[PDB]
Paper text:
The same alignment highlighted a possible merging of the 4-fluorophenyl ring of 2 with the central iodinated scaffold of 4, therefore suggesting an aromatic ring at C5 as a possible substituent to grow 4 into subsite 2. Substitution at C5, aromatics and flexible linkers towards subsite 2: Substituting the iodine of 9 at C5 with a phenyl, an electron-poor 4-fluorophenyl or an electron-rich 4-methoxyphenyl resulted in less potent compounds in each case, with thermal shifts of 33–35 in the range of 0.8–1.0 °C, translating into Kds > 100 μM. The reason for this is unclear, but is likely to result from steric clashes arising from the dihedral angle between the two phenyl rings (θ ≈ 45°), as revealed by the crystal structure of bound 34. Despite its reduced potency, the binding mode of 34 was very similar to that of 9 and consistent with our initial merging strategy.
Numbering used by the authors: 96 to 292
The structure:
Amino acid sequence: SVPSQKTYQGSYGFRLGFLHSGTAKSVTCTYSPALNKLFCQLAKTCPVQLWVDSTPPPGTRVRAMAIYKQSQHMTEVVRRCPHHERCSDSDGLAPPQHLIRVEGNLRAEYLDDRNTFRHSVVVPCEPPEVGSDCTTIHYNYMCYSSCMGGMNRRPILTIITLEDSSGNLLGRDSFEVRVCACPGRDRRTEEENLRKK
Ligand SMILES: O=C(O)c1cc(-c2ccc(F)cc2)c(-n2cccc2)c(I)c1O
Ligand SMILES: [Zn+2]
């Protein structure tokens, strides 16, 4: 009915990481550690790092799913709004209803859960490239937080799960997301609101 959001490093020490992009007016994606919140523009690249202490087995996968953050909306499926689901911006792989896409990975799979109707996107784990210490997934969010008939100004969380080949849980992390026109300004505003409180 509601997916768990409990942080769980698990046996492999799984956790996310984010770049330090700053809060200039021109920034397209920026992460606030104080808020545990990603701010991004519509359909722009959101780099999310995956970190582990030890290598999970071959066949491990990484899934992303959005849920509403407020408890009174958490049973509602997060989906694209009535406008964006019809705007024919498909990449050939993501269903037009899905909020979260993975960019530039032909092995991404998109699930419409047959029991919960929730959407998710899952990719195989791949080792870091030589010279790197982590792997990065590039996500896109395909509706604004404000879209009427969709998120409708309600905050969402993205839950990232590390899963075995059967889909069993190996690790979990999460972050809030706001999809907005000016992520740098909005991050600055919300961090100031937190400081004043
Ligand atoms: O250091 C490593 O060997 C390493 C290895 C993997 C990895 C590679 C292949 C596989 F099948 C399962 C896991 C990995 N990873 C990729 C997505 C989630 C974690 C990471 I981050 C690593 O740092
Ligand atoms: Zn929309």
